[PDB]
Design a protein around this ligand. Structure first.
Ligand code: NDP
Ligand code: NDP
Lengths: 242, 247
């Protein structure tokens, strides 16, 4: 009897899949709104439930839980940085969906891998839930590193797309999104088809150090320094030299 | 009135979608083959052409173009870095397709934004061509092509350094095929950026303001790679991508 305590895409993802007890949000308006598309109820000043998904910001997850504290259920959350051991109680689990949530694009779930960890009653639950949406998952103490990897893989890339957007913007291209995507999408796919070490191309890849150097000045001129740039090049060589 | 130099995968492109007079190559056969499939002649000890697409490695465009010597013909290369101006002649231009050339994947032809930059009278020649192949493009001054290329690098190459960092830590955790996992994580962001503004695609902990993780994840990062240089930089920017929205 899946209970979700967050009103905002992700529970929407799970709802749409595992289509249910209650759906809570700090304002029934949104709670209702959702439980009227998949079916359930409402209120963060709700009834007594008993599995519960606390899909709210990390820094809250713990608190929000130790505040509803009712009816024998199985505590779970989607944070890949924190364990279930935060709840500090019976049947605790953690199901992390390595993906970024456009709720439409996440409808290609069968590709999503899950980071699972729990206890007696908990683990098997998220394993089944995990199994019910995609093919498999992974079990994690290494929570930190495992999650860091998801951030420097689905978060950090925006910092590049952003950087590229700024300079294109300044260059007159009014709507660069379409261009930036084409390139970034390519790299993504190419990162697959070719494992990382064989996926590289560009200036550094082939020498052309006069291009890397001249673009360092061009990087500095557009922004205020060359730190990130020098960092990515030092990285790229590490890649390139494989 | 198109003559091409360099039987590269990229010329087979403009040829195919533009059905020509003289296709030069170092090999007479190689030129003769594309002429057989499209229509032209050959040799770099050629006849005397007169527009000339010099589609060869960025490394020889100038030299080669100075070993072509022919009369009345606007010159154009497709270098993403180099400028038309490298030709130092009255009728020049530069057409750059942001795409990587499988030959037929180029059936994606409709969605190739072009980076043009040409002469006064050399510009409308390339401007006309992009309009055909795919009506998406934009002119850029010759004194800004280095900026332009820089951009492509950030969106093209740079991500790789991110794929590298993660694969490294997924393997530290003994993950089967990390690239898959990586591709999933990254493509979700790669595509989303098409249906929305770059800055509307950031979803992580910085976004939520979960500094508590941003901070520990940085010590975890230091622990794994020796420093926090790259980590600090992106985080600074992401916290910047997230505030822009606060408006
Ligand atoms: N974005 C990502 O990159 C991914 C995040 N996750 C995990 O998902 C969880 C949340 O992710 P995310 O999508 O950012 O969520 P959002 O920040 O969009 O979540 C909004 C939801 O959190 C609730 N909320 C906001 N502030 C508070 C508060 N002060 N107290 C209680 N509830 C609050 C909202 O309340 P209300 O409905 O009342 O408005 C709403 O239900 C985390 O555990 C995260 O680690 C998993 C995969 C990916
Ligand atoms: N590859 C891509 O995805 C893209 C390339 N471009 C631009 O297109 C141009 C060519 O790019 P690229 O794909 O590397 O090309 P290729 O290496 O595929 O080009 C091969 C062609 O270049 C000729 N060539 C190679 N070396 C020499 C030389 N030393 N002297 C004379 N001719 C030579 C070949 O000789 P021969 O004729 O004898 O067979 C052949 O015709 C560049 O200006 C590049 O910046 C732009 C966008 C994308």
């Amino acid at each position: 009897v899946l209970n979700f305590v967050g009103t905002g895409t992700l529970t929407r993802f799970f709802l749409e899949c595992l289509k249910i007890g209650y759906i809570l949000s700090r304002s029934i308006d949104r709670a209702r709104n959702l439980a009227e598309v998949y079916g359930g109820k409402a209120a963060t000043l709700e009834k007594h439930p008993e599995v519960v998904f606390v899909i709210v910001p990390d820094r809250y997850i713990k608190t929000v839980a130790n505040h509803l504290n009712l009816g024998d259920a199985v505590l779970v959350h989607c944070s890949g940085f924190l364990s279930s051991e935060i709840f500090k109680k019976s049947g605790r689990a953690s199901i992390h969906p390595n993906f970024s949530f456009l709720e439409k694009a996440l409808e290609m779930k069968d590709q999503i891998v899950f980071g699972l960890e729990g206890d007696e009653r908990g683990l098997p639950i998220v394993k089944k839930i995990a199994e019910e949406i995609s093919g498999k998952y992974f079990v994690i103490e290494k929570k930190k590193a495992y999650h860091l990897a998801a951030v420097i893989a689905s978060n950090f890339p925006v910092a590049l797309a952003y950087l590229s957007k700024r300079i294109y913007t300044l260059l007159g291209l009014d709507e660069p999104e379409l261009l930036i995507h084409t390139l970034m999408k390519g790299v993504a796919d190419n990162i697959k088809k070719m494992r990382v070490e064989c996926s590289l191309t560009g200036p550094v890849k082939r020498g052309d150090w006069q291009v890397v150097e001249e673009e360092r000045r061009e990087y500095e001129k557009i922004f205020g320094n060359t730190v990130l740039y020098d960092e990515i090049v030092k990285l790229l060589r590490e890649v390139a030299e494989s």
